[PDB]
Structures are given as C-alpha cells and as structure tokens.
Amino acid sequence: MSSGTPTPSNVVLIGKKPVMNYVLAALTLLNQGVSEIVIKARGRAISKAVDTVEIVRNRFLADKIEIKEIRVGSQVVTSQDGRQSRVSTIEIAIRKK
Amino acid sequence: MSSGTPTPSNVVLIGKKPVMNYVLAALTLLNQGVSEIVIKARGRAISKAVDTVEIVRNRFLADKIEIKEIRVGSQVVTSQDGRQSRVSTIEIAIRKK
C-alpha cells in the first residue's frame, strides 16, 4: 500500500442519499476488494445505516455474511463555528465473505 | 388496604410522541421504583430511542447513570393481516442509580 487516497475506502458516511445508493455501494466495495466495511451514521441517519445493512444481509449474502461489531453512542463533534455538539453516532461493521 | 395488585412496568415503546414525553417518563419511572428501564424502538423510531437516553444521561444523572446493554437487529413481526415483516428493532437498557 503506497497509493494514499484522501477518499475513505472502508468507511462510509450516511448523508441525505436514498438507501439504494448505499446498498449498491457496499456490494461494489466487496467486489472492489474490501470485505469488511463500516457504515457510520449519526443523528437521524441512524435509521438508514441499519436499513442499508439489513437489506444487504437479507438479499445478496445472507448465510455467508457475518457481523463484526455494533456500537452506538454520543460523539463530541464541532459545529461550523467551533462549538462542541454531542451527536448520537453509530458504527456498524459487517464482514462479507 | 386495597385489592389491587402491583404490576411490572419496565419497557416502553417509541411511537409518534415528542421526545420530551419519553424523557420525563423515564425520570418518573426512577422515582416510581424502576431503576432499570428498557426503551424499545423500531424502524424510523430508532432515532428517538437514542435521542431520549442521550438527554437523560447528559442532564439529570450523568456520572451516576450506567449502561446495561444495547442490541439492534431485525425482528420478525406480524402485520395486521398476519404477514411476516422484518423490522429493525432496538433495545436500549440503562441503569439509573
């Protein structure tokens, strides 16, 4: 590994995109070379994080898919000014094989 | 003297109510006798379950509050007709002391 990408490879952030975009994205990552991927979401985006992984584990690979770890908690992040805001963050790590 | 027997109430379900109703409810439960309460939510209601407990642990009791367990997963429930629907369920158990 000597490339160095500013773009994250194994971590995705749930924004305002339709769930279908994230589902196909994770599937593409498996065939791209990433077997363990972590979907990170926060606030009201938590609902999509689970919705995405639930589809992925009950559609393309059910028996063969495996869970790695699931953690939910409030993270201290900074606002646009520089204000400490606590936001409920969730890291979902799944293992594809 | 009464002929009314006590009943166990330690689980709550997140519906369409504002978060302020759940926060105060959990606080009332502690002073009512229930130190360990489990907030159960599902689907798009997952966001309120965490939003509620986050406020409760960062307002009234921060240091003294303790987490018991957190589990998220799809449960197989029946629809109004009797159709098997999988829905992303979450059980958040906290310990108030």
UniProtKB/Swiss-Prot annotation, chains A, B:
Acetylated. Acetylation by the Pat acetylase decreases DNA-binding affinity. Deacetylation by the CobB deacetylase increases DNA-binding affinity. Acetylation at Ser-2 is involved in the regulation of the turnover of the protein. The modification N6-methylated lysine is found at residue 16. Gene3D superfamilies: Alba-like domain. Belongs to the histone-like Alba family. Transmembrane segments: none annotated. RNA binds at residues 16-17, 22, 42, 44. Keywords: Acetylation, Chaperone, Chromosome, Cytoplasm, DNA condensation, DNA-binding, Hydrolase, Methylation, Nuclease, RNA-binding. It is an enzyme of class 3 (hydrolase). It comes from the Archaea. Binds double-stranded DNA tightly but without sequence specificity. Involved in DNA compaction. Possesses DNA endonuclease activity. Prevents transcription after DNA binding. Binds single-stranded DNA and RNA in vitro. Binds rRNA and mRNA in vivo. May play a role in maintaining the structural and functional stability of RNA, and, perhaps, ribosomes. Binds double-stranded RNA (dsRNA) and exhibits RNA chaperone activity. Required for the normal growth. Changing residue 22 to A: Decreases binding affinity for RNA. Decreases binding affinity for RNA. Significantly decreases binding affinity for RNA. Abolishes binding of RNA with no significant effects on oligomerization. Its EC number is 3.1.-.-. It is found in: Cytoplasm; Chromosome. One of its GO terms (cellular component) is cytoplasm. The modification N-acetylserine is found at residue 2. This is DNA/RNA-binding protein Alba 1. InterPro entries: Alba-like_dom_sf, DNA/RNA-bd_Alba, DNA/RNA-bd_Alba-like. GO terms for biological process: chromosome condensation. The keyword Repeat does not apply. One of its GO terms (molecular function) is double-stranded DNA binding. Highly active above 45 degrees Celsius. Poorly active at 25 degrees Celsius. Forms homodimers and higher order oligomers, e.g. homotetramers. The trans (T) form of the dimer dominates at higher temperatures, whereas the population of the cis (C) form increases at lower temperatures. The T form causes DNA to adopt a supercoiled conformation. Homodimers assemble cooperatively on RNA with consecutive dimers binding end-to-end. HAMAP family: AlbA. The modification N6-acetyllysine is found at residue 16.
